[PDB]
């Protein structure tokens, strides 16, 4: 089971699932080998009914699609559609929050409100929305209307691109026509240009994809902005992660998916309903998090993370998981089947995200508290059905310090230098106590032993004094292996990194260092890391493609992560990817994405499947930037 997952709680539940006969994601993967080489390399097209068309990676015919599409067109078209699909996910999430804020400040959804008035005012100021003399409700109404307006063409480009990056970066991107005109506009134009008998030039296609990845960036940043206004900007919190956060004696409720508009209410309402839970014989309601919506309520409220990504089924295998409350994105549809064996109530809540066999509760912001009570009563019913049964909850869990928004990080640094908070961080880069910054992002992937690339690369970078930040299931992996525990700084961090983490933590009254890895939130909260990097570039007066900053999608899976990986490159970052995207069937395309893009944006993809080699390549990339700034290394 140790070739499946490096998580010990996960290995325990794999043994249970095996002997109970519950098929898992690793079983379904096994039943799928050997996988199709055509798809794996991207030499397959089904964009019309003359297809499917395949091209042999090597050898004789077929060498070309039926319409004449070459290998590089087919490969670039497929990649473009994954970027567009990822943008569509991050944009739908952000759109839903834009409507929720509009509804709230029009008096249409009283469960929702402007919780972070400071953030609302900086966002409105960043957008050129006038604040002085206006009600908060009116400023927020303007901000929501600007959010919705970035989805279509208008007099301006997408403001959640052009106002969040340094003007020098906006200029480099404009010169190549990469600035999105509208979020859903770019998504549609990609689907258009990649359909049969349209765009058939690899460079033209990939330039369209870079622009569409920036539409994804805009969706990510807008999602983070709106969630912070609605639900509070994260600040440092202490909690726990992994399966031992389940409690056999409580109604255990998992919030699972990506959009917190739902789960944040569940967190609030579940406290209300503790007495109703005690009456059925529970200690209370134990809300826990899965995937990125769990990270949302982890960053804001300190809700313990139960599990992530490829291993989500394992939470139900315990037999303790009474309800699993789903919005959308990255939910294995297998949970609906597996619940018939485990007793779990699987509840979908979102109109466009249903799973056959799951209970659906039609959630409306106008009725959020009504719906949350309805949902938590079903969980309480489910606990009663198992009241008495034996559960197997692995007694495994780690301590997690999280909540490192960009504002929290700046505030933390401001305790060493009140008037120039970025300077202490930069000073320690210059003198070498911080070699550079690495952002770990993205999913787990069944092809990679769970968390193996994340921890291996993280261990090597930290020993080399890299400041490591993390998001999404990359944060999930690092946290479940103790990387968000300050007590492991001594083991994990090099002396220079140790000193800076200790100096910052001691100055924030903790008598102890910051955690070895800074948890910056969910997948859309990759935009937080953009805000920090942009702030550092602006403070040093250079473009982002000169900073010693890199990214690692170490075990990535989802179309969202392809989009994220692609705008990481487009804003100027060397960007490591740990699972091959379907690109190797075309060397010209591979050459564009790993080398030639450097001359366009200054970022590039680093393809490397072996995590030790990946760490070396990421340190090289970081050290190359240091030398480019004239620093020692």
53 is in an annotated binding site: yes
Structure tokens at 535: 């702030």
Read off the DSSP letter of residue 67. Answer: T
Selection from ligand FES, ligand SF4, a second copy, none that 125 binds (CB < 5 to 8 A by kind) is none
* Near ligand FES in 13-42, by CB under 6 A: 36, 38-39
Q: List Cβ neighbours of 61 (8 Å cut-off, separation of 6 or more).
A: none
Question: Does the footprint of ligand SF4 cover residue 580 (CB under 6 A)?
Answer: no
Q: Please say whether the dihedral angle defined by the alpha carbons of residues 430, 434, 435 and 437, taken in this order, is positive or negative.
A: negative
Restricted to residues 162-201, the positions that interact with ligand SF4 (CB under 6 A) are: 196
For the residues of 326-344, what is the DSSP string, one character each?
E-SSS--THHHHHHHHH--
Q: Which is nearer to ligand SF4, 74 or 547 (CB)?
A: 74
Angstrom distance (rounded) from CA 366 to CA 429: 49
Residue 220 labeled ligand binder = no
Alpha-carbon distance 357 to 443, whole Å?
Answer: 26
CB of 492 to ligand FES, least distance (A): 41
Site for a second copy in 464-483 (CB under 8 A): none
Residue 341 assigned ligand-binding role: no
Among 37, 62, 63, 66, binds ligand SF4 (CB under 6 A): 66
Q: What separation in angstroms does the CA of 472 have from each of 289, 329, 454? A: 12, 12, 12
What does 535 bind: ligand FES, a second copy, ligand SF4, none (CB cut-off 5 to 8 Å by kind)?
none
For residue 439, the surrounding DSSP H or E stretch is strand 436-440
- Candidates 504, 260, 298, 271; CA nearest to 399 is 298
* Residue 493 assigned as binding residue: no
Q: Which stretch binds a second copy (CB under 8 A): 57-65, 109-117, 272-280, 598-606?
A: 57-65
Q: Which residues, at least 6 apart from 233, have a Cβ–Cβ distance to it below 8 Å?
A: 116, 118, 119, 405, 407, 408
Please, which residues have CB within 8 angstroms of residue 58's CB and are 6 or more apart in sequence? Answer: none
Binding ligand SF4 (rule: CB under 6 A), the pick from 1, 16, 51, 512 is 51
Report the chain's C-alpha Rg in angstroms. Answer: 24
| 51 near a second copy, judged by CB under 8 A | yes
Instruction: Name the residue nearer to ligand FES (CB basis): 47 or 397.
Output: 47
| 65 scored as a contact of ligand SF4 (CB under 6 A) | yes
Per CB under 6 A, the list member of 44, 331, 402, 501 interacting with ligand FES is: 44
Q: Does 46 bind ligand SF4 (CB under 6 A)?
A: yes
Only segment of 201-209, 244-252, 456-464, 592-600 that touches a second copy (CB under 8 A): 201-209
Whether the bond between 123 and the residue before it is cis, its omega within 30 degrees of 0, is: no
Closest CB to a second copy among 48 and 426? 48
Task: Determine contact, residues 309/473, Cβ cutoff 8 Å.
Answer: yes
* Type and span of the H or E element at 377: helix 368-386
CA distance 225 to 337: 36
- Give the footprint of ligand FES on residues 50-69 (CB under 6 A): 52, 54
Number of residues that bind a second copy (CB under 8 A): 96
Options 16, 67, 343, 623; binder of a second copy; rule CB under 8 A: 67
Residues that bind ligand SF4 (CB under 6 A): 45-48, 50-51, 53, 65-67, 69, 74, 196
| Known binding-site positions for [4Fe-4S] cluster | 36, 44-45, 48, 53, 67
| Known binding-site positions for [Ni-4Fe-5S] cluster | 258, 292, 330, 443, 473, 523
């Amino acid at each position: 089971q140790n070739l499946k997952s490096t998580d010990r709680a996960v290995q325990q539940m794999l043994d249970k699932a095996k002997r109970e006969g519950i098929q898992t994601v690793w079983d379904r993967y096994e039943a799928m080998k050997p996988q199709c080489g055509f798809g794996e390399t991207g030499l397959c097209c089904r964009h019309c009914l003359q297809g499917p068309c395949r091209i042999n990676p090597f050898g004789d015919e077929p060498k070309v699609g039926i319409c004449g599409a070459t290998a590089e067109v087919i490969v670039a078209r497929g990649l473009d559609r994954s970027i567009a699909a990822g943008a569509a996910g991050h944009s739908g999430h952000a759109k839903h929050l834009a409507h929720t804020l509009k509804k709230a400040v029009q008096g249409k959804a009283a469960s929702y409100m402007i919780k972070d008035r400071t953030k609302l005012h900086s966002i409105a100021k960043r957008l050129g929305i006038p604040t002085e003399g206006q009600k908060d409700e009116d400023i927020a109404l303007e901000v929501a209307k600007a959010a919705l307006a970035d989805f279509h063409e208008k007099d301006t480009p997408v403001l959640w691109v052009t106002t969040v990056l340094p003007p020098s970066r906006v200029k480099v991107l404009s010169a190549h026509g990469l600035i999105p005109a509208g979020i859903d506009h770019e998504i549609a134009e990609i689907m258009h240009r990649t359909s049969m008998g349209c765009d058939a030039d690899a460079q033209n296609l990939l330039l369209g994809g870079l622009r569409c990845s920036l539409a994804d960036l805009a969706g990510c940043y807008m999602g983070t902005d709106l969630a912070d206004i609605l639900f509070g900007t994260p600040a440092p919190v202490v909690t726990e992660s992994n399966l031992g956060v389940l409690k056999a004696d409580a109604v255990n409720v998992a919030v699972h998916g990506h959009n917190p508009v739902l789960s944040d209410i569940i967190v609030s309402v579940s406290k209300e309903m503790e007495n109703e839970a005690r009456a059925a014989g529970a200690t209370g309601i134990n809300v826990v998090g899965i995937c990125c919506t769990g990270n949302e309520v982890l960053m804001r409220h300190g809700i313990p993370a139960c599990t992530h990504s490829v291993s989500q089924e394992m939470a139900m295998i315990t037999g303790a998981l009474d309800a699993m409350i789903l919005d959308y994105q990255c939910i294995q549809p297998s949970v609906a089947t597996i619940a018939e064996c485990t007793g779990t109530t699987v509840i979908t809540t979102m109109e466009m995200s249903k799973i056959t066999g799951a209970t659906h509760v039609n959630f409306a912001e106008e009725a959020a508290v009504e719906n949350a009570k309805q949902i938590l009563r079903l969980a309480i019913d489910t606990f009663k059905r198992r009241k008495g049964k034996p559960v197997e909850i692995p007694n495994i869990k780690t301590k997690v310090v999280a909540g490192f928004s960009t504002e929290a990080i700046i505030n933390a640094l401001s305790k060493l230098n009140a008037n120039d908070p970025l300077k202490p961080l930069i000073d320690n880069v210059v003198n070498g106590n911080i070699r550079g910054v690495c952002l770990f992002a993205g999913c787990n992937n069944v092809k990679v032993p769970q968390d193996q690339n994340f921890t291996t690369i993280a261990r090597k970078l930290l020993k080399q004094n890299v400041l490591v930040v993390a998001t999404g299931c990359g944060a999930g992996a690092l946290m479940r292996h103790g990387f968000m525990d300050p007590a492991n700084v001594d083991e994990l961090c090099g002396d220079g990194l140790k000193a800076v983490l200790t100096a910052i933590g001691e100055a924030n009254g903790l008598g102890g260092p910051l955690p070895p890895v800074l948890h910056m939130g969910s997948c859309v909260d990759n935009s937080r890391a953009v805000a920090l990097v942009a702030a550092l570039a602006n403070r040093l007066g250079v473009d982002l493609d000169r900073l010693p900053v890199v990214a690692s999608a170490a075990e990535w899976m989802h179309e969202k992560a392809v989009a994220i990986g692609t705008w990481a490159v487009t804003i100027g970052l060397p960007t490591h990817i740990g699972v091959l995207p379907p690109i190797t069937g075309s060397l010209p395309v591979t050459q564009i994405l790993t080398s030639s893009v450097k001359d366009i944006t200054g970022g590039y993809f680093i393809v490397e499947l072996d995590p030790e080699t990946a760490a070396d390549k990421l340190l090289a990339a970081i050290n190359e930037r240091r030398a480019g700034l004239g620093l020692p290394w």
